[PDB]
Design a protein around this ligand. Structure first.
Ligand code: HEM
Ligand SMILES: [Ca+2]
Ligand SMILES: [Ca+2]
Length: 317
């Protein structure tokens, strides 16, 4: 189909997305940058979608975190999410897509601005949310591996798929974990969707980048980096460690797994056969240019190798 401005998409119902695309690139993502707003919108896709529990309810990826923000932003795990909820809500009011569609569309458009990134499959037509998420469904950085895996498992994600989704932390920072140092990233390249997160989490903890007593925070291997206790443990746990290491210097696998598992997450609570495929509306991400590396001056002796099956790859630094 050819839309009114002459841009093309496989399914005509998708044409309504193009003015929305233009609006968010300019006015949500500050001229299509891979910065804070993109990172925040990617975090939002998960805090919306993970509100899904067979036994308790919640409609998963349904826009409930905006529609019922009064409720959901009261949950402690949603700390700091109010900012991006407030930024996104006028876009939803202005345009004519559901909040659930908008959150996933904005997260996919956002990721597409990041070098190394992917086009996450995107489906149009989610109905408005009809219920708030139950409380206590969002993993916390101070939860054990067992508890995180059980929560993620309850929502339909195997332990490997939890590792796959956590590629998100390659383009990510913390403001609330240590409020003395807001915007400290999880990896050395928060504007690049790459394997640095999986490399650098495997390093020995050395210091705290701000204060030393924060709940959910592990020692970081670098002054300019923050480490979550959850990432620290998952990189090291027998359940997830070999999969975590499998991503190191393996950008093709990161791309494939992250796109597929993000699509599954975007569709929690939904039925893709009732929706319209609009994946071709997502912009083409830039590619990587620079090779995966240990931080300069670090070596293999700094890595806490946790995969018995396979030695940590030999990377230069
Ligand atoms: C599975 C267990 C997870 C835990 C314990 C966890 C924990 C966290 C924490 C503590 C922060 C920092 C919040 C702050 O202090 O500002 C964060 C940020 C972030 N999270 Fe995760 N997360 C998990 C999974 C995910 C998943 C599955 C996604 C996929 C979309 C994701 C995407 C992000 C992104 C992109 C940020 C950066 C936000 C920003 O820079 O504005 N996380 N997460
Ligand atoms: Ca939801
Ligand atoms: Ca990165």
């Amino acid at each position: 189909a050819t839309c009114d401005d002459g841009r093309t998409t496989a399914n005509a119902a998708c044409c309504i997305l193009f003015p929305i695309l233009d609006d968010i690139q300019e006015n949500l993502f500050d001229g299509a940058q891979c910065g804070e707003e993109v990172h925040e919108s990617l975090r939002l896709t998960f805090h919306d979608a993970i509100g899904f529990s067979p036994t308790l309810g919640g409609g998963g990826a349904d826009g409930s975190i905006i529609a019922f923000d009064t409720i959901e932003t009261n949950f402690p795990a949603n700390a700091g999410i109010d900012e991006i909820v407030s930024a996104q809500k006028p876009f939803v009011a202005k345009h004519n897509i559901s909040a659930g569609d908008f959150i996933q569309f904005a997260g996919a458009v956002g990721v597409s601005n990041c070098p190394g990134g992917v086009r996450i499959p995107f489906f149009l037509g989610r109905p408005d949310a009809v219920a708030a998420s139950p409380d206590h469904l969002v993993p916390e950085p101070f939860d054990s591996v067992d508890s995180i895996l059980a929560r993620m498992g309850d929502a339909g994600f195997s332990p490997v798929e939890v590792v796959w989704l956590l590629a998100s932390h390659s383009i990510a920072a913390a403001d609330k974990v240590d409020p003395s140092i807001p915007g400290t990233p999880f990896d050395s390249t928060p504007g690049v969707f790459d394997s640095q997160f999986f490399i650098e989490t495997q390093l020995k903890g050395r210091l705290f980048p701000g204060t030393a007593d924060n709940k959910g925070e592990a020692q970081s291997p670098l002054q300019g980096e923050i480490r979550l206790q959850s990432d620290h443990l998952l990189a090291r746990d027998p359940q997830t460690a070999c999969e975590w290491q499998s991503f190191v210097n393996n950008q093709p696998k990161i791309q494939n797994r992250f796109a597929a598992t993000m699509s599954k997450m975007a569709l929690l609570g939904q039925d893709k056969t009732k929706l319209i495929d609009c994946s071709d509306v997502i912009p083409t991400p830039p590619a990587l240019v620079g090779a995966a590396h240990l931080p300069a001056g670090f070596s293999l002796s700094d890595v806490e190798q946790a995969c018995a099956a396979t030695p940590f790859p030999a990377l230069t630094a």
